[PDB]
Each structure stands twice: as C-alpha cells, then as structure tokens.
Design a protein around this ligand. Structure first.
Ligand code: OLC
Ligand code: 61W
Ligand code: 61W
Ligand code: 61W
Lengths: 212, 219, 219
C-alpha cells in the first residue's frame, strides 16, 4: 500500500501541472481601459440610463460574459464600515464587473485586496485618503481611481454616487472583506445569500460559455 | 343497558375531550392576540407633539402615554437613555414599553448617523419629532426623506439604508418577535464597540419592561 | 506544635495570600510613576495648535524628545497606521507607549463618526486642527471643540464622537493601556479584516514597550 501513496501524488502532480499551465495561458475578457472608457462615455447621462446603456454595450462587445436581465439584481454591501449596493454583471475567478453606489453616501475602509480594482465614477463624488498620507483626493464623474493590490485607503462617497467597478486578481479572496460587516454588524443573512448566489450565477455563466 | 356507559371508556373519552378542547383553545390564543397599543396610535400620538422641542415633546408624550395605558409604561425610576450601536450606525434609546411582541421607545441622535436598518421578524414604525430621516430602499437607486410629523414604516423582512441628520429624534413602535430584533441591536455593541456596560443597560431595560408586563398581568 | 485542618489551613492561606496581594498591590500603587503629568501633553500640544498640522506635529515631537529623552520613539519607528474602531476610522502615529501611559498623534482627512469607546483609562485629546463633536451619554445635546481645546475622556465614560474633515489632535492616555488596544482593533478584526494594519499597530506598541524597557533598565 506504500506504492498507492506514490500513485496518489502522481496524478496529483499531473493535475496540479495541468492547472498551473491553464492559470498561466489564460487570457482576460475585459481590458481596464475598455471598461473605463464605456463608463466615461455615459457619465453625463442620469445613472439609471447610463447603467442600461453600459450593460447593453457590454453584452454586444462580449456576448456570453454578461449576466442576463433575469439574473441582474441590486444587493446591499456592508463592508469596512461603509454601505452601498452592487449589481454584478460579470464574475469569474480572476475578473469581475459590477455597478456600485449609494444614495445616501458612506465612509470607511476601502478594503485591502489581493486584486487590482478600478472604479470609474458615473455620478457623485469619490474621496480617497491614501495610507501614510494626511491629505485626501477627490475624484469626479468620468474619472477613474485605481486601487492596487495590498493597498488600503479610507474612502468617502458623497450623496448619490455611482460607479462601474472592474476587478482583477484573486476574486474569491475579496468576498471575505465584502461580507464581513454583513456577518458581524448587520446580521443580514438574506443579503449574504443574494451575494453568494450572484457570484454563483456569474461563475455558472463563464463555465457554460467556455464549454458552449 | 343500551343507555349505559362503561366507566373506563368514559374516563378515556373525557381525556380525549380535554385533549381536543385544549389543542383547539390553544390555537385561539393567537386569534385573541391583543396588542396594548394600536398600530397607528403611537404614530398619531407623537405627531401631535412634533411641534415642540424634543425634550418637552418626550416628557408630555410619556405623561400622555401613561394616562392612556396605566401599568404599561416604565416609571421615571427606570427610564434611561442608553446608547445603541447597530448596523454601522449609532444612536440613543429610551425604552418606554417592552414585551415579547411589542415595544415602544424614544430614539434619536445628536450628531446624526448612517447604516443598515436591519432585517427584523417584526414591523417597525418611526414617527419623527425633530430632524430628518433618510431612507434608501433595497432594489432602488434613490432615497426618500421624512420630516417631523411623518411616519416611516418598516415592514418585516425589509432592508433599507438609513440616515439620520443632526439632532433627529423619534418615537418607535415595533410588533413581532422582539427578542430576535434585540440580537441585531447589540451586534455592533459586541463586535465593534465592546461596550459591555451598554449591553447590560439595554438588557436591564428589557428585563424591567418584561417585569412590568407581568406584574401588571398579575395585578 | 499542633495540626491544622484541611479546611482550616486552606482558609488561613487564603487570608495569607489576601494579606500579601493587597499590601503588594498597594505597594505597587505607591511606587507608580508617570513620565508625563496629567495635563502636560495638553499644555504642550496647545502651543502648536493653529499651525499646519504637519508643522505642528514635527515641532511637538522635537519638543517632547527634548523634554523626555528615552521616552519618545525614534524617527525610523514613527509610522502612520489606520485605526478602525467603534464605527469610526482615522490614522494614528504612536509617539510613546507603555503599560500605563501612551502618547499618539491622531486624526482623519475625511472625517468620521462613532462610539468613543469605554476605557479603563483617562484619555485627553488636544485639537491641533479641524473639529471635534462630542455627545455625552444621557444627554440630548452635543458640544463642539475647536483647535487649542482639550477633550477629557474619564474612565468608564462613553460618548458619541464626530471628527470634521482634516481634524488632527494629540492624545494622551493613562490607565490599563492593553485593554484600550482591544477596543482600537475591534473593527480591524471584525469589519476590515486588515491583518497588515493589525500587525502594524501591535508592532508600534511593541516598539514603545521595548524603548520603555531599555530606558528603565539602562537609562
Ligand atoms: C497575490 C495576488 C496579487 C494580484 C495582483 C493583481 O491582480 O494585479 C493585477 C494586474 O496588475 C493587472 O494586469
Ligand atoms: C477601492 C474599490 C473597493 N470597492 C469599492 C466599491 C465596492 C466594493 C465591492 C466589491 C464587491 C464584490 C462583489 C462580488 C464579487 C464576486 C466580488 C466583489 N462588492 O462591493 C469594493
Ligand atoms: C427601521 C427602524 C429600525 N430601528 C432604527 C432605530 C433604532 C432601532 C432600535 C430597536 C431597539 C430595541 C431595544 C430593546 C428591545 C427589547 C427591542 C428593540 N433599540 O433601537 C431600530
Ligand atoms: C476618547 C478618545 C478615543 N480615542 C479616539 C481617537 C483614537 C483612539 C486611539 C487609541 C489608540 C491606541 C493605540 C495603541 C496603544 C498601545 C493604545 C491606544 N489608537 O487610537 C481613541
């Protein structure tokens, strides 16, 4: 039975080799500039219409990578002390695209992620206070703010602020932060479920499209 | 002996009778569900004092609430402002009535606050005496603002983002599984503020409210 | 010579350790010494209030080092680290820290609101710039503090606090300092999950303790 341990790690070595090759020869659906430019084009429109225009345009540029209307949903997000709402459009293990914002405004912890996040503002104001500094910056509609991996900032959204968010990195690691307050502060298990389901729907889509 | 009845059978028949009767009169306890306050009574009552400053408005409301419902309102000896930290927001409450199905309290903030309203197994109504109440309902990308005199109604299972301006005060009425709602109102107190003295104060106010509702029921 | 009971000597020793510990603690309280006087930091920080906070901080650190050599952290150990607690967020720079005292620079560029924390310590905050709103427990009014003013937070007290944008202050603390850190890291553990920040904070404390340990032992 000692040889069975060798066979166990034999196929384990090959499978891990298959995965490694796949993770490295994998390409991305979206470009950072692509998402930013679309949002910048629509920022002058009311956010409701801007959202609709952007979703339609994303679907024609990348069919089979954007969730259907039947699976689009606004779900509150409580994390880092702030509160907003998001609508997931695309979600894989390496990328996501979502609409985010708040009608009341909010402040808190940007989060510390294993990913690069790009927020292009559609309406309102985004205040950013970078770690190590004692001054803040403000971004306005049409402008894109990037959150590098391992960076942590204090953020503030003004009343009625909305943005398109494009994330790239280890996406399942971001859920730990995004659902923290939901678990320990709001106890909103229903919201917790809606979030996980939306991610599942996004993963479901990307899997079928890749398989056709 | 065609009219006679065996004693053993009759004894077991009556046991089935009391069992059938009890299991049915137990059900009517939910049918004879009596709430101490009417659903829109608290709102209609506080809408009258909204013109005053919150300090006098509270005192005159508490007095009026006692006269209308004697033995259902906590005495001045057990009235206390305690902080409330939940859903990312912070305020202070003053419990006036508390049972297992109902509660009435004075709530507000002198600074203002924002956060998650909470999903309760209950129906909550808030009537504004002073300040502003902002509500952002789930699924929408817009908010509504409520002014003094108006009443915000929060149905069961609903979740909204809330914002109170500076110096907003309100009376609050809740109907439903009150102990479960208490789990939310103490969440941030445990995992964010670690204010265990406040935790004690809140639970004590509930115990005082419950003690009153049983000593009134017993006398 | 005689024997003592298994419950007799047990109680006697329980009184013996009671006699020792109580007079040992009282001995400990008597030898207690503080590097900074109760109102020393406040008096010193107010002198630099009104200036650009960068300039005020730099001059203060130089002044503290000159007044208390061996009790202020070197430049290579000074570090701005985010603080998340009680619902609010800001940044701190630890200047001095032991088991009984601490001095730190604190503030926020964005502003913030939340629970002040209920500490086993006496904490004073002298404002260099910006605004400090305080809402005391049991009250329905709030007081605003402007630069040059000092806010004192007594042990066991709990307030709601609000900082305006670009508010900066100097904070001195006196009491059970390790218990205070527990609060300061509450949101970091259960809300932000920022382990890096958590590590930075604990490292800042360790550096303060090390410096205090060396100065105590070797001058
Ligand atoms: C450890 C994982 C860190 C991820 C960093 C990352 O996602 O970088 C994005 C990239 O730069 C975009 O092309
Ligand atoms: C500095 C930018 C930080 N952003 C700010 C805006 C909102 C965030 C945010 C991210 C998410 C999210 C939801 C689902 C999945 C699968 C992944 C991520 N939900 O909300 C984080
Ligand atoms: C949508 C309205 C949500 N409101 C917002 C304001 C404050 C609430 C709130 C509820 C309570 C409370 C305290 C003790 C007991 C036994 C029950 C309830 N204390 O505070 C909940
Ligand atoms: C009543 C004023 C409350 N203040 C408000 C501002 C920030 C505080 C605050 C305290 C600390 C801290 C960091 C390290 C150690 C060893 C001890 C304490 N880090 O931040 C507490």
């Amino acid at each position: 039975r000692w040889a069975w341990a060798a066979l166990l790690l034999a196929v384990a070595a090959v499978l891990t080799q298959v995965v490694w090759l796949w993770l490295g020869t994998q390409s991305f659906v979206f470009q950072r500039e692509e998402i930013a430019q679309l949002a910048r084009q629509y920022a002058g429109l009311d956010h409701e219409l801007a959202f609709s225009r952007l979703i339609v345009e994303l679907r024609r540029l990348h069919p089979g990578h954007v969730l259907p209307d039947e699976e689009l949903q606004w779900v509150f997000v409580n994390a880092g002390g702030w509160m907003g709402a998001m609508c997931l459009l695309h979600a894989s293990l390496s990328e996501y695209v979502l609409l985010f914002g708040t009608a009341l405004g909010s402040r808190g912890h940007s989060g510390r992620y294993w990913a690069e996040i790009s927020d292009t503002i559609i309406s309102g104001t985004f205040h950013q206070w970078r770690e190590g500094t004692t001054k803040s910056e403000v971004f306005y509609p049409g402008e894109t703010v990037v959150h590098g991996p391992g960076e942590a900032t204090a953020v503030e959204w003004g009343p009625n602020t909305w943005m398109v968010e494009y994330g790239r990195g280890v996406i399942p690691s971001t859920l730990a932060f995004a659902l923290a307050d939901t678990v320990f502060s709001t106890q909103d298990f229903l919201t917790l479920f809606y979030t996980l389901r939306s991610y599942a729907r996004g993963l479901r889509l990307e899997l079928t499209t890749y398989l056709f």
